[PDB]
Point group: C2
Chain length 340, copies 2
């Protein structure tokens, strides 16, 4: 009847109607290949809003055309993108939900034709292009791209920003010593590997005072790589720098074996939560409403992030609320249809 | 593995990918009160298309402003409506589904301010306005409105048209002797009560050669009213007149007791099907994929029409296909998410 999953959650001054969040998931549907928002996105994202998702994070959006994963990604490297994005914001908020955006750079895992960049000139695998080692100029400009992305997102009317430092992409690559072999201030030590992310958090916080997430991969799944222990100092640092919540997933820095099963990334989300004393978001194989409730109720995370579950059902919250016997607001058009 | 629910179904030359159909359900979301298509409709209808519904019938659309149920309904009484509707058609078809529209007149059950019309000047209940008995001129013009609605729907690019003669609305009111007390060619006998619908089917068929549904209420649930027996001659007539399928629901002509339970309108849909030798669509409380499969497999109907089920889940076909272990096409963006 009276559950935690469907309880409000305030981040800074922004209040989410529930703890359900849509994770960023690339839709590869910018057919115009210019980072533009499209018909697809205007159907896809508000559908989850209608289904009572409390916070919807728009897919990894490239801060530069270089930093796209693919050519068919969304972009925010130009003021021309603000209008497309502002409409998307309107269409999602109109139907109840809050909206965020994952500012992203794909680093050495970019599949865009041409030069791709990374902290060190070291490919993802045997089959991947070797990226260009970044100059201090490249670094500064990339931090600047992130700041501009944030400025644009603010102007488009987003409620939340997520700095995307996960899944083997640029920022994640600086953090992991597998990929960061630099011998200047940006590599070589725990504090140095953090600096890139740190300057991005500062750079974004200059132009944006709203709710701020950071996505991480808490484990590299590699003997010589990082583990969730390593992100505890980093999360403590993020807290001081003003990061409000940590979106805790894992993996994808280098090819690796991964044991996948229900809530397999929850203990990462909890370790960072308790040890760094910072709010976290759990993600990855959260099927039922029951399972989400246990996560929140046992202080494992503060928001449950959903992925395929919301691709499989955009109205998953209604399904979960039936399963938990909870009362939630139906759009007025579906009140009688959602017979409680 | 290999099921009937997810088998094609060709009507005239139009082939539906499966037997799933979204029933027309009024959304009361024309806030501009001018019959215009709106943001709401452009999210609502393509969401079900994305979820692999084979045929989506747009809500009861008023052929005149008088024939709206409410002021916030969709309309098709003007050529100005063609553009709004053509876009909606585009947004639904773009994402796989076929699209239809229920041409509607609300008769004496209209709640629009001003004059409402009916075959006889007899209200719905004690609490309802008394309608204006229709002149032969009124009749002709109403048939003409229906024809124009069809012409516009064709021009907007709809694949299917449904003449809405159900749920106690205008055409249904001519058919039922509860509501039709006329003593001219339009009332008094079984053949006379049919004539209004008959002239509408002819009038629509003049301007439209595509797939044509007719919605009926097979039972008035009243001792002196019609029963599904009575719609067998009428369905035989509809067949000759070129009607391709009959959308068989029931009730709502006058206030009445209704026993409601799973597939409670299926035997209506089957009687008309076998006895008139015409394709039918079953509707009303069809929860599972299992239950839909039995209907199709035992020749009870040819398409299952869905209502609240699709308000509760727009991707119900995916749910049903999991339940039946059937292979269906996911939009390319959700292929991996819909892991089969």
């Amino acid at each position: 009847m009276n559950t935690m999953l469907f309880s409000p959650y305030t981040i800074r001054g922004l209040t989410l109607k529930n703890r359900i969040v849509m994770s960023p998931m690339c839709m590869y549907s910018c057919d115009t290949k210019d980072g533009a928002v499209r018909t697809w996105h205007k159907i896809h994202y508000p559908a989850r809003a209608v289904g009572q998702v409390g916070l919807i994070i728009v897919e990894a959006t490239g801060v530069t055309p270089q930093g796209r994963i693919s050519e068919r990604d969304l972009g925010i490297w130009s003021d021309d993108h603000i209008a497309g994005l502002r409409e998307l914001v309107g269409l999602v908020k109109e139907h109840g939900a809050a909206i965020g955006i994952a500012l992203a750079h794909a680093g050495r895992k970019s599949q865009v034709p041409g030069e791709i960049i990374a902290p060190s000139a070291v490919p993802f695998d045997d089959s991947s292009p070797t990226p260009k080692e970044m100059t201090k100029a490249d670094i500064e400009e990339t931090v600047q791209a992130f700041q501009n992305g944030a400025r644009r997102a603010k102007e488009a009317g987003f409620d939340v920003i997520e700095i995307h430092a996960a899944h083997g992409f640029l920022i994640n690559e600086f953090l992991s010593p597998l990929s960061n072999r630099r011998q200047d201030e940006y590599g070589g030590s725990p504090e140095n590997r953090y600096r890139f992310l740190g300057e991005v958090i500062d750079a974004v916080r200059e132009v944006w005072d709203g709710p701020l997430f950071v996505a991480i991969s808490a484990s590299d799944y590699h003997p010589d790589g990082l583990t969730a222990k390593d992100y505890v100092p980093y999360a403590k640092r993020m807290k001081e720098q003003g990061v409000d919540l940590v979106d805790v997933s894992s993996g994808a820095i280098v090819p690796a074996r991964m044991n996948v099963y229900p809530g397999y990334q929850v203990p990462f989300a909890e370790l960072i939560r308790r040890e760094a004393d910072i709010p976290t978001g759990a993600v990855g194989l959260i099927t039922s409403g029951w399972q989400a409730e246990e996560i929140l109720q046992n202080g494992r995370a503060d928001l449950v992030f959903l992925g395929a579950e919301l691709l499989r059902n955009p109205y998953w919250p209604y399904a979960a609320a039936r399963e938990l016997g909870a009362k939630i607001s139906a759009p007025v058009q579906y009140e009688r249809g959602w017979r409680f």
